[PDB]
Amino acid sequence: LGFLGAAGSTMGAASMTLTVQARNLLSGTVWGIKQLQARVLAVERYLRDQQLLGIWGCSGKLICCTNVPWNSSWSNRNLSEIWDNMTWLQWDKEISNYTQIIYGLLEESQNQQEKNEQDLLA
Amino acid sequence: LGFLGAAGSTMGAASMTLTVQARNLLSGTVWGIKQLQARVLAVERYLRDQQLLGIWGCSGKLICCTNVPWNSSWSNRNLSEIWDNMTWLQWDKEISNYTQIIYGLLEESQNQQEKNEQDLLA
Amino acid sequence: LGFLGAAGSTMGAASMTLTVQARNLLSGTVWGIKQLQARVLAVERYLRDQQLLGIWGCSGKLICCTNVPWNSSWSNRNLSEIWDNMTWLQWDKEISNYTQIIYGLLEESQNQQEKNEQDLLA
Amino acid sequence: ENLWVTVYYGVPVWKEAKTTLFCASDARAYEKEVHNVWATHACVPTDPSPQELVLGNVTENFNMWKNDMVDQMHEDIISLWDQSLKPCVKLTPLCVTLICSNATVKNGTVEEMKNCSFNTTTEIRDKEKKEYALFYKPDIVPLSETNNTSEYRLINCNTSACTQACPKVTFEPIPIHYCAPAGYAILKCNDETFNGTGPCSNVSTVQCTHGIRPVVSTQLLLNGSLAEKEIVIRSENLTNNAKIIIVHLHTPVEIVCTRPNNNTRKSVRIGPGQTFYATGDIIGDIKQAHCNISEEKWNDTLQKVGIELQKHFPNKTIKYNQSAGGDMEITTHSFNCGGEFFYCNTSNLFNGTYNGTYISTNSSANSTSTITQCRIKQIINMWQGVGRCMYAPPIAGNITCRSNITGLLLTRDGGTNSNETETFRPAGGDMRDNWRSELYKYKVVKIEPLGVAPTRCKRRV
Amino acid sequence: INCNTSACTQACPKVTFEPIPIHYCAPAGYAILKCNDETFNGTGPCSNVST
Ligand SMILES: *[C@@H]1O[C@H](CO)[C@@H](O[C@@H]2O[C@H](CO)[C@@H](O[C@@H]3O[C@H](CO)[C@@H](O)[C@H](O[C@H]4O[C@H](CO)[C@@H](O)[C@H](O)[C@@H]4O[C@H]4O[C@H](CO)[C@@H](O)[C@H](O)[C@@H]4O)[C@@H]3O)[C@H](O)[C@H]2NC(C)=O)[C@H](O)[C@H]1NC(C)=O
Ligand SMILES: *[C@@H]1O[C@H](CO)[C@@H](O[C@@H]2O[C@H](CO)[C@@H](O[C@@H]3O[C@H](CO)[C@@H](O)[C@H](O)[C@@H]3O)[C@H](O)[C@H]2NC(C)=O)[C@H](O)[C@H]1NC(C)=O
């Protein structure tokens, strides 16, 4: 499907076959020290993204159902129309305000939920 | 058991205690720019291999059970023969043709299989 | 809470909110060759520690329950005393002898236990 | 109790360990040109955020002297300066016989600068033309045992060759923040009454160090940081009298210098496509370079030091004595100001004898009283075996050097006849000791996120 | 004409000038897009784009 075979496509098409866009984080060859700084590449980006994605309990490079409650004050467009009509390359621009709050909510929920696991077999 | 304590050994012995061969991707220290290139190490090899191994659903550096059907047209040597007698260092030489097809089958099955969890939870 | 908001704190406080000390392995930017040498960072430290933490079956940057038995000859201070009173910054100094044995026990138990997955779904 | 051992990730445990640190400078320097100032070039833009945070319940040992972070500072700054003197002209045609006048002034109330001349390589390598230049006296030496008194030598070609400093780089010290990589952390000691060793009973995690000023010095500690509440005196062991005792000061003492001579720069073209700069005629009258201090404030400060040196040798009273002597580079206070290098004979500041009692400043006989002489050199062997030469080009106009004293470097002197007035001296020393006076608060540690404790979970297959 | 402003260097005969093509090319994680509308005035939206 290519590196960007879903940009500007609907949610259903772009959410299936996410792997084609996930795998293209491997490259690089020698052009000296300035190029070797360019090898932060996957070595830093992939590790940052995977650290975030694992801290939220989602150790998987695909769709992962977290539990944090989506809210009235963050959505304001009808639920049903998003998953059929719209593309990511405008959804990110609607939602871009509340990334940081969500990025803490998901990890504090994980720290909460694994604790109950620690008791539920103790 | 050492870095290669199962090369040319039977499959049963070589498939148990895989850890001794997995851990030795940590070494390397300074000798100029060429050495700093030389330390691709885990930093590229392990990230690559683990990205493949996780995209197929096997987030574990050991034996993992995938579902893709082994086929008549890929095997042609008796099933019971291989696991008791043969070694990896001659099995990879017979299976070397069909790596690329399996490497896509394993991930498309994973994407196919996580979906049924997404909707069942819904 | 800050990078070290539990140094010299009790087990209860220091074991909840482990994430704050786990995230900060992301920094560094250009100064000559020695900087890019200095970027072992996550690129080596996190990969090492995560390889150990996954080889033992604990693929998660938080509390994980292993099965290896605590022993009379390693503890010798009252069990109930530790989890309410002491800090990590004096516990690691009392346990520092037996790290290497535990680091093999935890992986050989993992290899022992994932084997039964092969039988229990074959 | 058949408890199952677990593993935790994110454990707060320290290990004191070695590492490099990033040199980082403030934001305003980074609109400027390359090497202007050098801190914009070889050091990263900084960020004060986040705020330093206290570690509420802790007890951690610090050892100022055993620290090696200062050695990383030292090596990095030397390597930084060495790279700064590659793209400039390596003089060379000026290490020739210099014909110089011998009229002499001879009448006193004056100390002057010698006038010299030399032949130069212009835009034709098979032609030489006549030039003249004013040179400060130390930079020039008699040529030969053959006593032609007019033939003088530039001080080079006996040990090394030299490089002119480019005008596009200036010496004013931009602040620097020596800063940690992730996975390491910088811990700061918050006890003000800290003897330099033992436990700091209050410690804080810090993003990285507050601004260090790498001001060059040899006998006194110029612009810097001052003590919280009083004088604090530090040394590894007073048993060995040969080690350098460092004194911090609470109240500042002010120092101001001046080069009242009005030097003028003379441009000389030396080799193809590269210029050498010298000193031309001096406008106005000839005068002496000097530095001033207020003597009642200096006397008070010295007495306050005296009540802190008497603490460790109670039966023996205090006497401050003149410098070691011998080499000029050791027995003089030297520093940098306005790009020029001063060399002061400083026996005047450190003659006295203190006796525990407080001889006060009040009533003031004359509030305008002061204690006041320095030489100037262009050929500078600034560190030993570093590529020693730097030829500091002349600057136009005149300069002033109003500054603050914040500490002393001293020698405790051995006994003599068991005298009650056993003495102390000013002491030159390494530049590492200069920077050790300002990084004492800090140590480096390595974080160990993985640790094991007994849970009560059992495990499933 | 030299020596009034700078010194000079002879070009080595082992290197010659004629321009070989170059493909300035992306790192992984980044991507290069290409504007496929020929009637393009240097700004505004490219209504046809290709990765
Ligand atoms: C360091 O030493 C160097 C020498 O090693 C000094 O440099 C010399 O400086 C002098 C003075 O400037 C300079 O001599 C003058 O050069 C002028 C070039 O234009 C000449 O025109 C001038 O000639 C007049 O003065 C002579 C006496 O010096 C007279 O003999 C002569 O006839 C001229 O006088 C007539 O013309 C003037 C014109 O104004 C007129 O007013 C008179 O009435 C009369 O009609 C000088 O010769 C040297 O050339 C310099 N040497 C070099 C090598 O450059 C330098 O000054 C010293 N440094 C210091 C700080 O003192
Ligand atoms: C170079 O030297 C000249 C002259 O020696 C310096 O000029 C003098 O600078 C001082 C300040 O340092 C001026 O003093 C002024 O005095 C008045 C008195 O009423 C006061 O109102 C001001 O606050 C200020 O202090 C002085 O006027 C000025 N000129 C002279 C002839 O003294 C010059 O500053 C020196 N430059 C450098 C870079 O060193």
Numbering used by the authors:
A (entry chain L), B (entry chain G), C (entry chain B): 520 to 547, 569 to 662
D (entry chain A): 32 to 139, 150 to 185, 185A, 185B, 186 to 309, 312 to 321, 321C, 322 to 354, ...
E (entry chain K): 194 to 244
Question: What do the study authors state?
Answer:
The HIV-1 Env is a trimer of gp120-gp41 heterodimers that are heavily shielded from the host immune systems by N-linked glycosylation and further protected from neutralization by conformational masking and considerable sequence variability. A glycosylated region near the base of the third variable loop (V3) of HIV-1 Env forms a supersite of vulnerability that is targeted by antibodies originating from diverse germline genes in multiple HIV-1 infected individuals. Here, we determine structures of antibodies in complex with HIV-1 Envelope for all observed members and ancestral states of the broadly neutralizing HIV-1 V3-glycan targeting DH270 antibody clonal B cell lineage. Here we used cryo-EM to visualize the interactions of a complete inferred DH270 clonal tree with the co-evolving virus Env.
The I4 clade leads to mature antibodies DH270.2 and DH270.3. Inspection of the theta and phi angles indicated DH270.3 had predominantly shifted its rotation about the epitope. The most notable mutation in DH270.3 was the light chain Y27S reversion. A clear shift in the position of the N301-glycan was observed relative to the I4 intermediate. Consistent with the observed rotation of the bound antibody in the I5/Env complex relative to the UCA+G57R/Env complex, the Y27S reversion resulted in DH270.3 occupying an orientation matching UCA+G57R. A cluster of mutations, including an improbable VH G110Y mutation, occurs in and around the DH270.3 LCDR3, near the contact between a loop adjacent to the V3 GDIK motif and the N301-glycan GlcNac base. Additional mutations, F93S, A94T, G95N, and S97A, result in remodeling of the N301-glycan interaction, shifting the position of the LCDR1 Y32 side chain for interaction with the first N301-GlcNac and interaction of N95 with the second N301-GlcNac. In addition to the angular shift and LCDR3-related mutations, a G103S mutation in HCDR3 adds a hydrogen bond with the N332-glycan GlcNac-2 N-acetyl moiety. While DH270.3 acquires several mutations critical for neutralization, including G110Y and S94A, the selection of the Y27S reversion may have limited its breadth. The greater breadth of the DH270.2 antibody compared to DH270.3 is likely a combined effect of improvement in the N332-glycan interaction in DH270.2 and the Y27S reversion in DH270.3.
